[PDB]
């Protein structure tokens, strides 16, 4: 019943301690006897991996939590902990990164998160497209690694919608010669700009479009969670659709939601039989966790009746539960908002969608 944790900032450690101290038995009905422990992340990736391999798997932990922004790998992803704990089918909570490539179950056996990856963002964009009949759209994704998976998911969903897009290919990561493709898109069906790149890779496209006065009516800009922050708000046109998921921005709320999900998973595991401990990773031990596929099934293949989010219909991939969205608009950096996605269908809010074209009704998309 021992549970571990691996954070870097002191605030995350304090929040985890408070979460495991108070309101830890509220999730469910069984009186749990978990032994919560936390390990501070090392500045070096090898030393931290060694500490993980000598502490977590040796103490027979069931789940972890990685949510610190300043990762020691300088890539904003928990690489060593995941590569060390993937052998024992340990559900490495990679809620600190949104990379859709790492969320795939191909190269990562047990790697879940509570943050919508690029695949979930593309799914939400596709769901918003079919509402206003946005079939012929263009994709200006400049990123390659995750952009390939993004455009693959986009084209597969378009084929599943009995249709086919026109531009689903990439040109160059962070280029400045997009004038030709922009002039070609000036005489296309829809001006819906689909950009799912990084900070600088999207800022380059934003400034290149601003240099060509690409801020007319009908340009629906679909951004992600970490695409407009710090300085990308000025380069992007005023009125972008800024997607934001509940307990995704706040670190404390995200950690609380992750702890609640872990508690619900432990309770569901204790409800059934075959309650075995993972093999202790000592010297010479190369044993595989027997309850690995069953744990994956009770994590992603099953549903959750309670928890922090209090929603149902959990995704079959362990990426993010389909729930209500908090999509806020950024008209001149104000508190305006647009139609949010409520898990199953977009429901308009009190104030309607404001468009950068000048009007508030359906633009000339």
């Amino acid at each position: 019943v021992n549970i571990g944790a691996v954070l870097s900032t002191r605030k995350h450690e304090q929040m985890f301690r408070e979460a495991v101290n108070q309101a830890n038995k509220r999730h469910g009905s069984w009186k749990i006897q978990l032994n919560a422990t936390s390990v501070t992340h090392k500045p070096n990736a090898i030393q931290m991996a060694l500490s993980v391999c000598e502490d977590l798997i040796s103490s027979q932990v069931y789940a972890i939590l990685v949510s610190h922004p300043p990762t020691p790998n300088d890539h904003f992803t928990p690489t060593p902990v995941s590569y060390t704990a993937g052998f024992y089918r340990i559900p490495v909570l990679g809620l600190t990164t949104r990379m859709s490539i790492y969320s795939d179950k191909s190269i990562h056996l047990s790697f879940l998160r509570t943050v919508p990856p690029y695949s979930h963002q593309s799914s939400v964009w596709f769901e918003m497209m079919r509402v206003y009949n946005w079939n012929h759209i263009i994709l200006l994704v400049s990123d390659d690694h995750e952009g390939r998976a993004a455009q693959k998911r986009l084209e597969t969903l378009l084929e599943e919608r009995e249709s086919k897009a026109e531009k689903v290919l990439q040109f160059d990561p962070g280029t400045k010669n997009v004038t030709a493709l922009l002039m070609e898109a000036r005489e296309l069906e829809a001006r819906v700009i689909i950009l799912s790149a990084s900070e600088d890779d999207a800022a380059t496209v934003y400034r290149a479009a601003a240099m060509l006065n690409m801020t007319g009516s009908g340009y629906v800009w679909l951004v992600g969670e970490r695409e407009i922050s710090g300085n990308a708000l000025r380069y992007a046109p005023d009125g972008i659709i800024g997607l934001q998921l509940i307990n995704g921005k706040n670190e404390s709320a995200h950690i609380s939601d992750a702890v609640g999900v872990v508690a619900q998973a432990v309770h569901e595991l204790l409800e059934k039989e075959n309650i075995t401990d993972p093999p202790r990773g000592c010297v010479g031990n190369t044993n595989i966790w027997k309850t690995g596929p069953l744990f994956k099934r009770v994590l992603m293949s099953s549903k959750y009746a309670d928890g922090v989010t209090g929603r149902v219909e959990f995704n079959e991939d362990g990426d993010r539960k389909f729930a209500n969205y908090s999509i806020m608009n950024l008209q001149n950096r104000k508190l305006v908002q647009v139609g949010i996605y409520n898990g199953t269908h977009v429901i308009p809010n009190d104030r309607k969608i404001i468009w950068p074209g000048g009007e508030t009704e359906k633009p000339r998309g």
């Binding site: 708000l233 000025r234 005023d238 008209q331 001149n332 950096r333 104000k334 508190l335």
Partner: protein
Amino acid sequence: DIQWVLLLWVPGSTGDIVLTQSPASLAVSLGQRATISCKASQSVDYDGNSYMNWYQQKPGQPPKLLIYAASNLESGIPARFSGSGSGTDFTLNIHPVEEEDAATYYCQQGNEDPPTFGGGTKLEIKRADARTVAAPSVFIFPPSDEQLKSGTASVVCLLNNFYPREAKVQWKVDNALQSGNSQESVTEQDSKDSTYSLSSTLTLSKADYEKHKVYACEVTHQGLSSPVTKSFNRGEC
């Protein structure tokens, strides 16, 4: 050395004068008692009366000691009041409120070798009470194009009838989490209506002005309860 000359003439809320009576000034106009209590129960009673030489530094007249030691009238100042008192209680009831008796009485410590100051309560108008109010203007002067091209602009708002203590800087623009966009700029005060002047060096560049929707400020003072804010959009060069 313990008390030097401050920026303005009145002590104000945060003033370096401990011998002051009123925060801003006394509510005296003409022919009424204006007691300038400069009581100081410090180590100045060196076997006799406490030395207290109060003087004025009005613009145009050099600082001249009115009464030395608060006991004997100094030859050179016309007898226009009754300045007496021994120990710590100093009787300085200034009943005649004329154009000459409307300066900051700098109560200098006679037992202190370095020239000290005191008082500061100028006998002028005080529009800070319930009936006496002060409402400045509400027109916002648009910043010049040169200040916008130079990066560091200055959105100076027109404030004429206000006091240094009445500096409403708490703004509220669509829940803007910022800290620091102006200062408490003041100028010389007038004996007619206390005409001050407020300015603001708020930096506003081309990009910042481009990503700017409204400029609804808050000029709510004790007298100007309903200020007409000028929430203009971009392009007001």
